Amino acid sequence: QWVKDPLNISPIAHAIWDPQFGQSAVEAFSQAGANYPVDIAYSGVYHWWYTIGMRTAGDLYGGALFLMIMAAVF
Amino acid sequence: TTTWIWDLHADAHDFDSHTSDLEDISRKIFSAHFGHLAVIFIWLSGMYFHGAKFSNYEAWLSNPTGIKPSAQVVWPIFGQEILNGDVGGGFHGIQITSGLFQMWRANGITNSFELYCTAIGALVMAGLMLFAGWFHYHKKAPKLEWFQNVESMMNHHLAGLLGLGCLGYAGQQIHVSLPINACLDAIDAGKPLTVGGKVIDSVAAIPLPHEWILNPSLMTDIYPSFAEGLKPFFTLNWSVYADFLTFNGGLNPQTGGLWLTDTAHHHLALAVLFIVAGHFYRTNWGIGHSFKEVLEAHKGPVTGEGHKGMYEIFTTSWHCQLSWNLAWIGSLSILVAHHMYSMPPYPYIATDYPTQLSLFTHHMWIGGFLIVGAGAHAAIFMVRDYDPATHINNLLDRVIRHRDAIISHLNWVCIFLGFHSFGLYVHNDTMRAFGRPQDMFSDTGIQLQPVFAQWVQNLHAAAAGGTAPNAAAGVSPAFGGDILAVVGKVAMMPITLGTADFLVHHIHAFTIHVTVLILLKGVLFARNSRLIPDKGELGFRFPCDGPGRGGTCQVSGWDHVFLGLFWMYNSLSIVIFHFSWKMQSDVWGSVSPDGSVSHITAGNFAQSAITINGWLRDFLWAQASQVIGSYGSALSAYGLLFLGAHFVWAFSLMFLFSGRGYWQELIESIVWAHNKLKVAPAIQPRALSITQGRAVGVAHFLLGGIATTWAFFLARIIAVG
Amino acid sequence: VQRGSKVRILRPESYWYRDIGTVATVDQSGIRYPAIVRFDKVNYYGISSNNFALSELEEVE
Amino acid sequence: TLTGKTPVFGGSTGGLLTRAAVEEKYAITWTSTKQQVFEMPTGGAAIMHEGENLLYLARKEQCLALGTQLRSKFKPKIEDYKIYRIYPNGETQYVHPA
Amino acid sequence: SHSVKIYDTCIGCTQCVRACPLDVLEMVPWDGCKAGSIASSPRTEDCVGCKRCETACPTDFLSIRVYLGAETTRSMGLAY
Amino acid sequence: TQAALYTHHQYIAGFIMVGAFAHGAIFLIRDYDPASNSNNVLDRVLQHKEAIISHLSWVSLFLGFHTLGLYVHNDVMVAFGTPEKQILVEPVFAQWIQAAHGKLLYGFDTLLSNPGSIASTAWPNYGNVWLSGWLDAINSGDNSLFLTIGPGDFLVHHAIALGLHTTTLILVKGALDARGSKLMPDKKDFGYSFPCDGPGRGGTCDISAWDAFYLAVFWMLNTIGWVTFYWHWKHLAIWQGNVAQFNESSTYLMGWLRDYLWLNSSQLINGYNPYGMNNLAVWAWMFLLGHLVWATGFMFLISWRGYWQELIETLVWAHERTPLANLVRWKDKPVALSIVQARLVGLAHFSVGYIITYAAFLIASTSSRF
Ligand code: CLA
Ligand code: CLA
Ligand code: CLA
Ligand code: CLA
Ligand SMILES: CC1=C(/C=C/C(C)=C/C=C/C(C)=C/C=C/C=C(C)/C=C/C=C(C)/C=C/C2=C(C)CCCC2(C)C)C(C)(C)CCC1
Ligand SMILES: CCCCCCCCCCCCO[C@@H]1O[C@H](CO)[C@@H](O[C@H]2O[C@H](CO)[C@@H](O)[C@H](O)[C@H]2O)[C@H](O)[C@H]1O
Ligand SMILES: CC1=C(C/C=C(\C)CCC[C@H](C)CCC[C@H](C)CCCC(C)C)C(=O)c2ccccc2C1=O
Ligand code: SF4
Ligand code: SF4
Ligand code: SF4
């Protein structure tokens, strides 16, 4: 959803799982067009992976699996 | 070397390190005490001379509720004449917060000539103090048995300095200040100006106070029992005097201050109590109690030999007396702060919010500094004047023998108090950030009501007519009652105690107990410990005993005073922050004609002072807008001093975080560049010593930290109050 | 050498490295450091007198 | 193995700990000509006796600090103090003056 | 334990032996200086590392040097 | 994201730069051979080491006396109500470099802003294909490519030069005195990291080369602090459409306190309040956590060891004398932290509290309005 509109969609870093949240903190962190609590990414990995050609979550998933076997190689 | 330059100023007033014998120090101490009284009299003369020549005091006397007290005028140089702000009365100067004006009006002073002769009169008691310290030292010095005559000193200071001062001020109150203030409270109101020819109409039309003395007919139209004279005093038919000696018991609704007829009966009842107390001690005329005999009588089963040795050290050690007298003057100066905000004793001082905040804060800081000095000179006593033969199985011997029980229990109660006071604040920060306000410690969540303090408040609000029957009102409106308002502003209202007051009171209990822990560990371990068995041989003030035994940095009694000064600073910063927020949120503010109080920060203490975020946002961020926005105005000196004190506090961290072995080696590369060329000195430059670098570091930390709060408090309360 | 000559010191651990000093006394006993040299300025703990071997020393005076 | 009177002392909290029972101990013996008052190295005043004295302390530094007090703080001076290191088996090694 | 080293520049002034609060040091006849005595360190296993000996040494640089080594119960100054 | 990425890589570069000097000093103690390296370039920098350190000391003192003096003078002018008496030096050398790279705002018209200069035409080959795209981007007033700089940018570059030179001065003097000085001539015998050499010879607290690492991390964090404060405030002024607020307030230090620190704290510290919370509540909570960690470091830096060792001795006594708890015995004897360790622990709390305070403030002040 971010590559369709990179100017007004905020990137998502990961989901939040904090059982100590109250219910108004769940709604306060359910942001960036998500219905679960998220962190807005500020590392720039969306802008970097979009420029170098990745477009789908399946693109990043095969990249994630490849760095795991590469780490197992090292 | 340059080390001797600082040791000359550091070893200046350490008189018992100059000379051994006890009688010659006592003459230097007695003479220097005259020299300090003269320094006070020169300072006190400057407050009256600047009160008489550089102020708006009579203009303030005409309009006390709408003119700001000012007594400093700034010369027009460099653009700095902008600090002469318009304080009202056609006067351009610096608004003062010392409360000199409200004290002089309670003294019956009405014009600038009575302030001028008091300035000159203080200036000649400065010279007579400087003569009496020269006469009693350089010519005719006293002797040690006169110095050690503590039964006569306690008689002559109870019935004397305290008795004849409380009685002599009751004479000044009844014959001089009670008429003029009953006169000034009439001219302040529209009616009645009762009565006479002259009736009275001007402030200058009030008679000069020797005419109340010369003419007893002037004294009788206000207080009718002055025609009865001095005669029912000697018959003990005393209820006829209930016109200028009242027990009204509260605040005057006209001025906001204490009833000046109550203060005259206060100083009179203490004069009898002090003079009766001054006939307690046995002297040349046979009868009385003796210090030593009443000390050895109190000797019970739990406590060994009891109070043996207590007479010997309190008559042979100047440091034992100085440590104990600093503990009580500092504790009194703190008690002065609590009793002067809540029972405001001067006319139009209670609605002068820049004065009430400044006087609480000043006497808090003086009290905390002197209590730290009590622990300093108690540790000096243990190093220098403590004697093992004086203390065998007495109270001083037995506290040393269970000092590991005392310190480790004080250690535990400090960790308990820090967890169960500060941890409640960060529990509240976390619950509020979580969106769980029902899980907070608050008045609307999990309540921590101060029920013992609320019960004591109920007894003091139901005292008038009950357990104090002959008193009209309660002792202060702060304990309960209705809102007392001078012209537009609250003087004093009930100060409610909820969950936010429970939390901050246990913060105060925590930060005082840690300061006690640092200073009591410094006293009980000054001579030796399990780490340093000969610590008393190394002195009171030494940096360490080397990097061995793991490292023994800051083991001395001096270094516990050094660490105790930071924790005193931490303790009293929260005390004056508690005062400044609670008064602005729940007490001070403007009164409507309908009778509802609009407080300065609008009641936000109960819901914001329970988190650290609320103290940061609603107290520290919100109220600092007056000091950072003051540039280009009359309060711009507070804006510059806010930044300059931030600088000095940060500058201290260079000394506190570093050590001199770095700085001595950097100076080696500087003296090479000085020897390579030119002027390089003969007095060879050194880094500061380890102790001095700690002393320099704690001095700039305390100066930069306190002056930051000073510029923040004064710029806030002058603009908004 | 002769008592009273000005003396330059050429060892690194000394405070008075390449400093000019005044000799107080010399003894012919056979000890490792026979030359008492006084100095105009104190070291880091106030000595101004250190014994030196003449195998370490330079003089111009 | 060592004789001497224990000084008159009510006890304190600064004395021996578990280390004295399981690792190592120290004793200082000295002979005095007067029944006088001395300061304990662990804090507090005690009464030394005429004749042989015996005091058990935790560290060697506490014993040597007492011996420095026995030298410099009394008229006449007390030089004859002996310091022993006591092991838990009972072996008592004379360590000062070595 | 700590390492206490006495160097050949010792003048035999015995001030380091008087300064030691743990009785680590003693004087040995040496005939390598005018005093004929040199400092020695037999009981270095009792040395705490306080460096009071180095403070008392009047030679420039110090004839006695303390090297803080492996920590024991004795060298850490522990009464427990 | 642009604010976070700059501050991330500048603080990491500051930590890496200080560690370059740290291991340069460890080399001089452990691995350096004055027999092999005999009168080479590395032997020679140690021989005039009092000239390098004293010249770093003069540049640090010259910059600090005149950068702070210019800021305080401007502060007194604005506070007295006369903001035209303040000293505003234009950075004419770096404006000339911008004009020399193709910026037309200052009107110097040298090479690459001169259309007929030798460097712009690239005469014998004319292979200047980049030049049209470069001058299009450098004259667009909407990117961060060679921003307009004024008198507020002059003073803060000289504050940065002060921080670069002082941090180098601590690190160089730590490296060059690592083998010895006059206070401690045999310093290489004691290693890279040791507490002190005792209170003798005047006192030798923080004499090791590790201790000059320790002091320089403070000056590094202050330097990257001044760098990233200036980057953030200049960019926050541009992004808010008010570049004049930086140009008016950055010449005196109250403008930095009020219009940058105080003004942009508003949405951060309202991440939770008595009326509720929003998504900035995690940054508000981290902001206060960073103030707490930073201040906890002051305890390890100001209070030193022998206070704490004597305090732990009463706690060891209390455990052994407490029934039901003296059944539980420690394996390791509780002692206070060492002299070196609490300098490290105090620096670690100071540094962690430094980073996460600013990171919470940088992200929450930028993402609240953007
Ligand atoms: C009745 C009060 C009283 C008296 C008579 C004394 C007297 C003494 N004190 Mg004590 N003491 C006191 C209160 C008092 N003190 C308090 C309140 C504290 C806590 C701070 C202490 C803590 C203390 C310590 C830790 C020590 C003493 C020592 C001494 C002795 C030597 C002082 C000296 O020569 O320094 C000379 C005076 C100075 C060097 C003045 C320095 C003032 C500094 C720089 C702060 C100035 C700030 C100033 C107010 C702000 C203006 C800033 C502006 C100028 C820019 C002397 C017996 C020393 C001692 O050895 O006793 C045997 C010692 O080590 N005192
Ligand atoms: C209980 C003690 C006490 C109290 C509460 C007061 C209260 C007052 N005094 Mg008074 N006075 C007193 C004793 C006291 N006085 C003494 C000991 C002297 C010096 C001899 C004076 C000399 C004096 C002068 C010259 C003036 C005042 C003024 C005032 C009024 C305002 C300033 C003030 O002092 O704040 C309140 C002070 C405190 C809360 C601290 C009390 C400090 C004393 C030393 C404690 C005494 C110990 C205690 C009584 C012993 C316990 C006895 C027994 C029950 C065990 C206020 C009503 C001023 C005024 O304008 O009146 C309207 C004024 O100009 N007083
Ligand atoms: C904000 C900074 C800070 C903090 C947190 C501390 C904390 C402490 N100081 Mg220190 N101190 C400080 C600044 C600080 N100080 C500075 C700047 C100096 C230099 C002068 C000192 C010098 C000093 C001295 C001289 C002494 C202390 C003592 C203490 C302890 C007091 C006892 C207590 O309340 O335990 C409870 C602990 C706290 C209240 C800290 C907050 C803990 C929170 C609420 C708990 C949350 C974490 C929890 C355990 C969950 C685990 C998290 C994770 C590990 C999973 C406490 C640990 C004293 C002491 O040791 O007395 C026993 C003592 O004598 N300090
Ligand atoms: C804001 C706090 C602060 C300030 C102002 C300083 C300032 C300085 N540091 Mg320090 N430093 C600090 C915090 C601070 N440090 C901290 C927290 C640490 C970690 C412990 C260090 C660790 C450190 C190291 C390791 C070194 C420095 C050095 C320096 C000097 C750098 C040279 C320079 O810029 O000269 C300009 C001078 C200034 C900026 C200070 C003067 C301020 C004004 C001009 C004084 C005006 C006089 C004043 C009005 C008179 C007083 C009034 C009255 C009481 C008499 C400078 C004095 C270095 C050094 O000394 O090299 C030569 C050095 O090597 N610092
Ligand atoms: C202490 C020590 C050490 C360390 C060192 C270090 C750490 C240093 C660093 C240093 C550094 C870190 C340096 C840097 C430098 C840089 C530079 C110097 C650069 C250059 C540049 C240039 C020259 C450029 C120019 C240009 C421009 C600007 C534009 C374009 C064109 C050109 C390219 C021309 C060691 C290891 C040896 C060891 C021993 C001791
Ligand atoms: C150094 C001081 C020592 C501080 C020690 C602090 C320990 C922790 C405090 C909790 C102990 C008392 O806590 C007590 O609990 C009850 C039950 O939640 C609170 O009750 C509160 O929450 C309950 C939820 O069920 C509500 O129904 C109730 O209306 C509300 O008042 C009390 O207001 C509080 O007084
Ligand atoms: C900075 C610093 C120094 C260096 C500071 C020093 C050496 C103080 C010296 C500064 C003064 C102001 C130098 C002034 C010299 C003359 C008095 C000036 C003569 C001219 C007058 C007329 C003004 C230490 O010595 C030190 C020691 C221990 C722990 C921390 C530190 C520490 O942090
Ligand atoms: S080592 Fe130093 S103190 Fe000891 S005998 Fe030699 S010179 Fe004297
Ligand atoms: S370091 Fe301390 S214990 Fe060790 S020899 Fe020196 S003085 Fe004795
Ligand atoms: S660091 Fe300083 S105070 Fe601590 S033991 Fe070493 S010399 Fe002493």
Residue numbers in the entry:
A (entry chain aB): 76 to 149
B (entry chain aA): 44 to 764
C (entry chain aE): 2 to 62
D (entry chain aD): 4 to 101
E (entry chain aC): 2 to 81
F (entry chain aB): 372 to 741
Give the text the authors published on this PDB structure:
In the atomic model of the white PSI, each monomer contains five membrane-spanning subunits (PsaA, PsaB, PsaI, PsaL, and PsaM) and three stromal subunits (PsaC, PsaD, and PsaE). The density map for PsaF, PsaJ, and PsaK of the white PSI are rather poor compared with that of the other assigned subunits, and hence, these three subunits were deleted in the structure. Sodium dodecyl sulfate polyacrylamide gel electrophoresis (SDS-PAGE) analysis of the purified PSI solution sample showed that it contained PsaF, PsaJ, and PsaK. Therefore, the poor densities for these three subunits in the cryo-EM map may be owing to the weak association of these subunits with PSI and partial dissociation of them during the grid preparation for cryo-EM. The cofactors of the white PSI monomer contained 90 Chl a, 16 β-carotene (BCR), 3 [4Fe-4S] cluster, 2 phylloquinones, and three lipid molecules. We found no Chl f molecules in the white PSI but seven Chl f molecules in the far-red PSI. Chl a865 (a865A) is bound to a region in white PSI that is occupied by loop2 in far-red PSI, and it is lost in the far-red PSI. In agreement with the previous studies, the RC Chls were a pair of Chl a/Chl a′ (epimer of C132–Chl a) in both white and far-red PSI6.
Among the two photosystems, PSI catalyzes the light-driven electron transfer from the plastocyanin (or cytochrome c6) at the lumenal side of the thylakoid membranes to ferredoxin at the stromal side. The PsaA and PsaB subunits bind Chl a/Chl a′ as the primary electron donor (P700), and A0 (Chl), A1 (quinone), and Fx (4Fe-4S cluster) as the electron acceptors. Here we analyzed the high-resolution structures of the PSI core complexes from H. hongdechloris grown under white (white PSI) and far-red (far-red PSI) light conditions by cryo-electron microscopy (cryo-EM). We purified the trimeric PSI cores from H. hongdechloris grown under white and far-red light conditions and solved their structures by cryo-EM single particle analyses at resolutions of 2.35 and 2.41 Å, respectively.
